[PDB]
């Protein structure tokens, strides 16, 4: 098809990351609003950007949730890596959660350059590595802005969601190093 030096033919291959589902999580995006992280063939996590909120109380009962060991430990591990990877997070009010009955659900209020919405969107940009630019509108520029007001993270069941981008573990594996690399004093 395309020959170089008359003897070397240019050939390609595309990896199907879906087969890594049993060992590592996989990030992907459905459309502009919805993005997903898949753990195995059953459980998962849905990162959705919406102008509509889902939690109105500004409390996060993590200690209660830990004691009542109902939630999936895997999903809790990736929801911790996300919140820790946020840089310069200083407005705990925007962080509101609801872990009643193991159902994990976390909401980040982006309405509250340098603001708390940048750091949460920077970490979201890394997390869903494929197809995150579609929701960002940012381009190249540090400072990230979006029309949407809330980033809602909910537990969900596995389906054929990865429509815009293929699944990949590259996003999650990168946040692991930059986990507690940027946090203020408590």
Partner 1 sequence: GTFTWTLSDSEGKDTPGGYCLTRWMLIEAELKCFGNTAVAKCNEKHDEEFCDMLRLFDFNKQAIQRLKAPAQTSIQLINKAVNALINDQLIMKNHLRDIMCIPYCNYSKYWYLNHTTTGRTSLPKCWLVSNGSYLNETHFSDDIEQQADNMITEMLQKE
Ligand X SMILES: *[C@@H]1O[C@H](CO)[C@@H](O[C@@H]2O[C@H](CO)[C@@H](O[C@@H]3O[C@H](CO)[C@@H](O)[C@H](O[C@H]4O[C@H](CO)[C@@H](O)[C@H](O)[C@@H]4O)[C@@H]3O)[C@H](O)[C@H]2NC(C)=O)[C@H](O)[C@H]1NC(C)=O
Ligand Y SMILES: *[C@@H]1O[C@H](CO)[C@@H](O[C@@H]2O[C@H](CO)[C@@H](O[C@@H]3O[C@H](CO)[C@@H](O)[C@H](O)[C@@H]3O)[C@H](O)[C@H]2NC(C)=O)[C@H](O)[C@H]1NC(C)=O
Ligand Z SMILES: *[C@@H]1O[C@H](CO)[C@@H](O[C@@H]2O[C@H](CO)[C@@H](O)[C@H](O)[C@H]2NC(C)=O)[C@H](O)[C@H]1NC(C)=O
Residue 101 near partner 1 by CB under 8 A:
no
Distance CA 110, CA 120 (A): 8
Q: Which stretch binds ligand Y (CB under 6 A): 13-21, 70-78, 97-105, 178-186?
A: 13-21
CA gyration radius for the chain?
Answer: 18
- Residue from 69, 157, 177, 180 touching ligand NAG (CB under 6 A): that is 157
Q: What are phi and psi of 55, to 5 degrees?
A: -135, 130
The strands making up 150-157's β-sheet, listed across from edge to edge, are: 26-29, 34-39, 43-50, 150-157, 105-109, 95-97
Q: How far apart are CB 4 and ligand X at their closest, in Å?
A: 23
Residue 156 near ligand NAG by CB under 6 A:
yes
Cβ atoms of residues 134 and 93 within 8 Å: no
Q: How far apart are CB 149 and ligand X at their closest, in Å?
A: 26
Name which of 45 and 85 has its Cβ closer to ligand Z.
45
- Residue from 162, 169, 172, 175 touching ligand X (CB under 6 A): that is 162
* Residue 114 binds which of ligand Z, ligand NAG, a second copy, none (CB < 5-8 A, kind-dependent): a second copy
Residue 88 near a second copy by CB under 8 A:
yes
Containing 81, the helix (H) or strand (E) segment is helix 73-85
Q: How far apart are CB 76 and a second copy at their closest, in Å?
A: 6
Name which of 113 and 140 has its Cβ closer to ligand NAG.
113
Sorted by sequence, the CB contacts under 8 Å of residue 68 that are 6+ apart come out as 102
């Amino acid at each position: 098809t395309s020959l170089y030096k008359g003897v070397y033919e240019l050939q390609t291959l595309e990896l199907n990351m879906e087969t890594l589902n049993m060992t590592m999580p996989l990030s992907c995006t459905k459309n502009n609003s919805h993005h997903y992280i898949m753990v195995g063939n059953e459980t998962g996590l849905e990162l959705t950007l919406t102008n509509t909120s889902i939690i109105n109380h500004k409390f996060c009962n993590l200690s209660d949730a830990h004691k009542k060991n109902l939630y999936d430990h895997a999903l809790m591990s990736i929801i911790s890596t996300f919140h820790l990877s946020i840089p310069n997070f200083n407005q705990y009010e925007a962080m509101s959660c609801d872990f009643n009955g193991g159902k994990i659900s976390v909401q980040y209020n982006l309405s509250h350059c340098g603001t708390v919405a940048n750091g949460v969107l920077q970490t979201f940009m890394r997390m869903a590595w494929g197809g995150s630019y579609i929701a960002l509108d940012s381009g190249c520029g540090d400072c990230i802005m979006t029309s949407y007001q809330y980033l809602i993270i909910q537990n969900t069941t596995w389906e054929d969601h990865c429509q815009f981008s293929r699944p990949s573990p590259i996003g999650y594996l990168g946040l692991l190093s930059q986990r507690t690399r940027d946090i203020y004093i408590s």
